[PDB]
Subunit: 295 residues, 4 copies
């Protein structure tokens, strides 16, 4: 088929790259952790020597890395990664500040490459199932070329707008999630503190004007949804530290546009409190513990 | 059928009492505004001389009044309204502080009456259509007697818990609504300020982990949903002043249980800012104006 | 001299009433705790049978009680305490909601009594030293009669305004204190986290535009002021639970005037978090622990 | 004496550089605005062709510029300004993110230069009078050389710590100022809304545990201090836009250390609201208008 280079085999990168393999693409892979690489090699990937080595046969490069100033330093620094090229389609799927995505976008153009920012939403579970949503900034042209690849890794594919718009949509969405999650945790705790059964209150609000994604699919009160992180001591799911990061990127976007974000900013302050408390690697619904005394 | 006394023919009271009439009940009605009374009389109600006069033939008394310390002073003050009685089923459907609802509940019991607190959620539109949700505190017994009446005025009927639990569920739900509404308005403004089309961003978040009731049915950005208050300059809908009231009741419940409500409390501060600005009678999604400079 | 009745011998009441004794007044005292009464009796007070019994010889009644709806229920309920009277000067020095103080004020007038609300600021230490500040609402006349008594218990005496104005000044002042205290704790933690020595940062801010009462006299960072609660594990001082109460009264005043209090409301949310954590009886500067990971 | 190069003759730069002249130093000056340069030339400065030209005879370079990523791009970009040097003492007195100050500090060291970050606090008025406070990060050695220059432009000189510590102290201090200023404005509005005279409430709080810098010297309520910006419609003073900038830098420092700043972050959200409202160039105490309906 097409030769894909996949850089970044972490929590999200590994199952996303594995899904490309199951779809029948040939992948050269690179990650900093050897065992992450070996996992992909066992499933039919070839291992590359490095990021630069990987892209050196590829029709398309897909990155998925954990840090905002890891990603930019990788692509931009004047000694690869963009310096090594074709033109090849680039799909940059990390979550990074929109400003930083535009900066990479422009350098990619200045060089003749079709690039998309296509950050992703959904779980480690979405990544594994291939049901991720992509939020895509860039040229319609480049989105058309990338489509079959997004369809292999994901389900909803939104063209959010021009360069950087995928990151903008992503940071707005995740900031709103944080707000609705704290809103939900505080509402649950208030009701229960005032004599209500958690499951009765959850159902009422879910089905009414308080309704939201957390209440549909991710209730922060232990025992309400038995398959949610709250019912297994907030293990797994989506780390509070990652939510705090995402909120931090949203602040950067707000400074850039002078947008007021009183709920998001407060959400971020509360996430930082969770970090002081040692909860960086708990699922982000652990915010429940701020409000629930009997935990 | 059964003789109902209906006290309070305001925004919600009038269409609720009219719906009882359409269902075939006989109503004696009272309100402080003569034209509100005449509206009900034109539709087949009999006019009562007062609140006390009204209940003086009734199988059931349903109140629906605008103020928390109007309601309690009416029922409790030692010269009616509870002093005048049967036993008769009482449905108190105003939104009032849970503490205040328990106080009325206990006085009702101390006297032999079956009472429910059954505050309501849905619009002036829900009230008119008979699709309101009721959130009901009290004895299962009394809920069973009241059921056909709730079914005439509404659609979802939740037994939230014992005495006062309907108010608790109501204030938790509306506080959560306020949080998701400000969250949504601030997210929309952030995205648009960073180059996104409002309708594209709205669809992405609605369909993703930022998803919520406001995004499904009540988008705060003008032009996104043409039938929403935002698309007609925030006229009608659900007044900001009423949202500020509801948030205020939620604070009272929080003080009573020592519950921390950082998002709700902040929501209330922002609603109060809207009030200083003259927006008390705009739809509560007018909170959008705090964030959107081009309004 | 004059016969004083003193109701309430708690943390503040005991040393305040003791100071009146040292000034040479005759006191009849009552409190719910026998040992609090015995303390005053050892210092030269006579013990009264109750609140009603106490006022039954008095030129002036001074109360100082812990709860807002203890105080009002005591004076108003229609069976003493205001029902038993002269006219006698009443000094009500508890901290209670302004609305509640006006209610008591009016009942006192409706009966011929000169009453002041004169809530107090300063420590258990201020109370003991007789250096308290009084914040006084009521008639200039009544303030003139009370003056020598305030001078015995305190130092700064402010006439804040008419009936209830002492409570208004008190709740505004304490809400502002809470804001500056959290502001200070968060600033100290930010500086230290970014490599600064706590005492160097404290001195800079104290002497600059960040300067405030907490920095002058009550630094929340352990070791900065060796005589402050922070340097002895937040024992003693002014309980977080009492600060949360005061903030709660300030919210009630805000609802009454539709005033927006985003900083105070947030301060209250953070105090409530401290309560969930078990810190109700620590000094209110324990808020430092929210921000300082190494505590 | 010593030859000084002064880069940046804005609001603060002009009077600071003028004060050096009055102290008897020889200055070569550069700024982007010709009239700012001419002002200094009229007072005895020589005009330089540019930033690079200016430093090309100098014993010491002092910069004072408005933007955080103006300053760094000027000194670092690989074509001056640090590339042009001696070693010469560098005093970088802009307010910029601590991270950015360390970055410049390290490049300066990597090259043999003694550099201090010495951001400044005080007014356009402090700058003119020579009463500024300096908050200084860097080697004690370099502080000793710079001392007579700081003494010419300022009064309190604090050694905040090592490289970047001046910026850290500055951003903590100004964030705390913003919190106490909003705290003060909201407290004043609450008191006045509840029947108090603004000047009576101001005096009580200033002299009590609510006491702070704003209340001593910069009251946000019009008419309270006749010489404050509030008494002349918030013209002049210290622009809200600059306060919003400073708060933004404080957020960057918080992200860098994972510090929770709930009051500062909220302060920033409220400042951004002021910006949407058109108040960017009003004195930052204009935040009063959020709370005071009769303005």
């Amino acid at each position: 088929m097409k030769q894909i280079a996949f850089i970044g085999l972490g929590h999200m990168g590994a199952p996303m790259a594995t899904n490309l393999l199951k779809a029948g693409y040939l992948l050269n892979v690179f990650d900093l952790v050897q065992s992450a690489v070996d996992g992909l090699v066992a499933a039919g990937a070839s291992a590359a020597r490095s990021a630069r080595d990987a892209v050196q046969g590829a029709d398309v490069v897909i990155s998925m890395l954990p840090a905002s100033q890891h990603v930019e330093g990788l692509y931009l620094d004047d000694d690869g990664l963009l310096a090594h090229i074709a033109p090849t389609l680039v799909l940059e799927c990390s979550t990074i500040a929109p400003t930083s995505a535009r900066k990479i976008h422009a350098a990619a153009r200045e060089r003749g490459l079709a690039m998309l920012d296509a950050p992703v939403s959904g779980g480690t579970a979405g990544a594994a199932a291939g049901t991720l949503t992509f939020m895509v900034g860039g040229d319609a042209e480049a989105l058309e070329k990338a489509r079959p690849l997004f369809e292999a890794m994901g389900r909803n594919i939104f063209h959010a707008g021009p360069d950087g718009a995928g990151q903008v949509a992503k940071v707005c969405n995740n900031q709103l999630l944080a707000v609705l999650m704290i809103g939900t945790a505080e509402a649950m705790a208030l009701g229960v503190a005032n004599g209500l059964e958690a499951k009765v209150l959850a159902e009422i609000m879910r089905r009414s004007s308080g309704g939201n994604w957390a209440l549909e699919v991710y209730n922060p009160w232990p025992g309400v949804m038995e398959n949610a992180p709250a019912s297994r001591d907030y293990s797994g799911g989506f780390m509070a530290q990652l939510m705090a990061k995402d909120l931090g990127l949203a602040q950067e976007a707000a400074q850039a546009s002078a947008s007021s974000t009183p709920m998001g900013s407060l959400a971020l302050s509360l996430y930082r409190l969770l970090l002081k408390q040692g909860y960086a690697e708990r699922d982000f619904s652990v915010v429940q513990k701020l409000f629930d005394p009997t935990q």
